């Protein structure tokens, strides 16, 4: 869209994670209100421009289930990724205001997440590589969209994601040296669903620093939903997502026809209204 740091004006901070900070900004010359993610990396100009070059592909993403992209550029040691502003935030934020999320809302989220993944896989042959509650954004129109996926191979390598932060959604196969695949996103999604359903990160079942957590994941059995509160469909769905053997774990075709999804797809759920009310 042709953006440059002076076009912008800061409205407020939407939040920060381990690797960056996101601002709600005004893009003055167009009038657009967007979210601006700033990423700071101590890398040589060569690979940096390679990142901005690779990030340019986000322009060709165009799906109801994928967050909107406006442009990526570099300035002042910061890489800027400029997005559709999502007025409802991430599901990780909603989760703090709501404590936990209803399995009917979660069925809608799953249908969104599944469709978004398939879109990225069918249309761009990229895997998401970071499906978690904080990377699922919602807005007051009741839309549910994925962001922060691995569009840039250079950017992935530079961020050394795997050891940072306190929670991990990495799958067993990956932490045992397997090549990355869509199955690994299924595991992430199920672990996400469990976390959003019960209201806390499932591993371990009710201090653990990253490496122990990672060891715990490849060794202990997978997390499961509690015993009385959720339908037996929702927990078979989540169970089929968290099968430790990627061979057995369900795939997107299978999940899309699972009992839980068929029902959720039919249930008349007012997500926007549930949202503006849970957080207003
Ligand atoms: O922003 C990111 N992650 O957030 C961390 C920094 O706050 C981000 C990270 C990576 C690299 N990566 O790929 C996933 C596996 C782990 C990993 O390290 C990447 F390739 C990206 F393109 C990113 N941004 C991004 C993508 C789509 C939209 I629409 C908007 C965006 F901002
Ligand atoms: N397009 C957007 N619209 C509104 N809020 C956003 C948008 N993108 C990101 N955010 C918020 O900005 C904050 C940080 O996002 P982010 O930088 O990716 O850290 P994170 O994904 O939460 N954890 P991590 O990826 O490990 O650093 C979160 O609270 C998001 O909900
Ligand atoms: Mg994120």
UniProtKB/Swiss-Prot annotation:
Effect the entry attributes to changing residue 211 to S: Loss of interaction with BRAF and KSR1. Loss of BRAF-KSR1 dimerization
Broad class of where this protein is predominantly found: cytoplasm
Effect of residue 162 to D: No effect on BRAF-KSR1 dimerization
Binding of U0126, residues: 37, 148-151
Residues where Phosphoserine is found: 158, 162
Its membrane topology: Peripheral membrane protein
Domain Protein kinase: 8-261
Keywords: Acetylation, ATP-binding, Cardiomyopathy, Cytoplasm, Cytoskeleton, Disease variant, Ectodermal dysplasia, Intellectual disability, Kinase, Membrane, Nucleotide-binding, Nucleus, Phosphoprotein, Serine/threonine-protein kinase, Transferase, Tyrosine-protein kinase
Gene Ontology molecular function: ATP binding; MAP kinase kinase activity; MAP-kinase scaffold activity; mitogen-activated protein kinase kinase kinase binding; protein kinase activator activity; protein kinase activity; protein serine kinase activity; protein serine/threonine kinase activator activity
Record bears the keyword Nucleus: yes
Residues reported in the UniProt entry to bind K-252a: 84-86, 134
Tissue: Widely expressed, with extremely low levels in brain.
UniProt-listed GO biological process terms: Bergmann glial cell differentiation; cell motility; cellular senescence; central nervous system neuron differentiation; cerebellar cortex formation; chemotaxis; endodermal cell differentiation; epithelial cell proliferation involved in lung morphogenesis
Subcellular location: Cytoplasm, Cytoskeleton, Microtubule organizing center, Centrosome; Cytoplasm, Cytoskeleton, Microtubule organizing center, Spindle pole body; Cytoplasm; Nucleus
Record-annotated active site: 130 (proton acceptor)
EC main group: transferase
Effect noted on mutating residue 161 to Y: Increases interaction with KSR1 and BRAF
GO cellular component, one term: early endosome
EC id: 2.7.12.2
Catalyzed chemical reaction(s): L-seryl-[protein] + ATP = O-phospho-L-seryl-[protein] + ADP + H(+); L-threonyl-[protein] + ATP = O-phospho-L-threonyl-[protein] + ADP + H(+); L-tyrosyl-[protein] + ATP = O-phospho-L-tyrosyl-[protein] + ADP + H(+)
Mod. after translation: Phosphorylation at Ser-158 and Ser-162 by MAP kinase kinase kinases (BRAF or MEKK1) positively regulates kinase activity. Autophosphorylated at Ser-158 and Ser-162, autophosphosphorylation is promoted by NEK10 following UV irradiation. (Microbial infection) Acetylation by Yersinia YopJ prevents phosphorylation and activation, thus blocking the MAPK signaling pathway.
Disease note: Cardiofaciocutaneous syndrome 3: A form of cardiofaciocutaneous syndrome, a multiple congenital anomaly disorder characterized by a distinctive facial appearance, heart defects and intellectual disability. Heart defects include pulmonic stenosis, atrial septal defects and hypertrophic cardiomyopathy. Some affected individuals present with ectodermal abnormalities such as sparse, friable hair, hyperkeratotic skin lesions and a generalized ichthyosis-like condition. Typical facial features are similar to Noonan syndrome. Melorheostosis, isolated: A sclerosing bone disorder characterized by hyperostosis of the cortex of tubular bones, frequently involving one limb. The lesions may be accompanied by abnormalities of adjacent soft tissue, joint contractures, sclerodermatous skin lesions, muscle atrophy, or hemangioma.
Family in the record: Belongs to the protein kinase superfamily. STE Ser/Thr protein kinase family. MAP kinase kinase subfamily.
Free-text function comment from the UniProt entry: Dual specificity protein kinase which acts as an essential component of the MAP kinase signal transduction pathway. Binding of extracellular ligands such as growth factors, cytokines and hormones to their cell-surface receptors activates RAS and this initiates RAF1 activation. RAF1 then further activates the dual-specificity protein kinases MAP2K1/MEK1 and MAP2K2/MEK2.
Quaternary context: Found in a complex with at least BRAF, HRAS, MAP2K1, MAPK3/ERK1 and RGS14. Forms a heterodimer with MAP2K2/MEK2. Forms heterodimers with KSR2 which further dimerize to form tetramers. Interacts with KSR1 or KSR2 and BRAF; the interaction with KSR1 or KSR2 mediates KSR1-BRAF or KSR2-BRAF dimerization. Interacts with ARBB2, LAMTOR3 and RAF1. Interacts with MAPK1/ERK2. Interacts with MORG1. Interacts with PPARG. Interacts with isoform 1 of VRK2. Interacts with SGK1. Interacts with BIRC6/bruce. Interacts with KAT7; the interaction promotes KAT7 phosphorylation. (Microbial infection) Interacts with Yersinia YopJ.
Protein's recorded name: Dual specificity mitogen-activated protein kinase kinase 1
Organism: Homo sapiens
